[PDB]
């Protein structure tokens, strides 16, 4: 009841809190450099489309 | 049939070995049927005969 303000409610870059594995939720924040190598069999080849 | 008077253009050329080239043709035929098919240059290495 002297306390300070919880990190879910004073925390930068947009983050949500549980006591839970201590995970800091969907903190939405810069860039992430994705790579993806898709199953051929789910192209189409291009002289159907 | 004699075809003149129509038009070619690739869509998806593929640089490279396996028939990965095509393109479309306005074929612009007198009759119907079968027309041979070939590239006198041998830049181009046809599947379709």
Request: glycine share 14%; hydrophobic share 30%.
């Given at each position: 009841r002297d306390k300070g303000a919880p990190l879910n409610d004073v925390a930068p870059?947009?983050?949500s809190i549980a006591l839970?594995?201590?995970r800091a939720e969907n903190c939405a924040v810069g860039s992430i450099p994705i790579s993806i190598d898709i199953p051929d069999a789910?192209?189409?080849?291009?002289?159907?489309? | 049939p004699t075809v003149s008077?129509?038009?070619c253009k690739i869509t998806e050329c593929t640089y490279a070995?396996?028939?990965?080239?095509i393109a479309t043709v306005a074929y612009k035929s007198s009759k119907a049927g079968n027309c041979p098919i070939h590239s006198p240059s041998g830049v181009a290495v046809i599947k379709e005969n």
């Open positions: 870059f947009g983050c839970e594995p201590l789910a192209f189409t080849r291009i002289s159907e489309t | 008077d129509l038009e070995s396996d028939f990965g080239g």
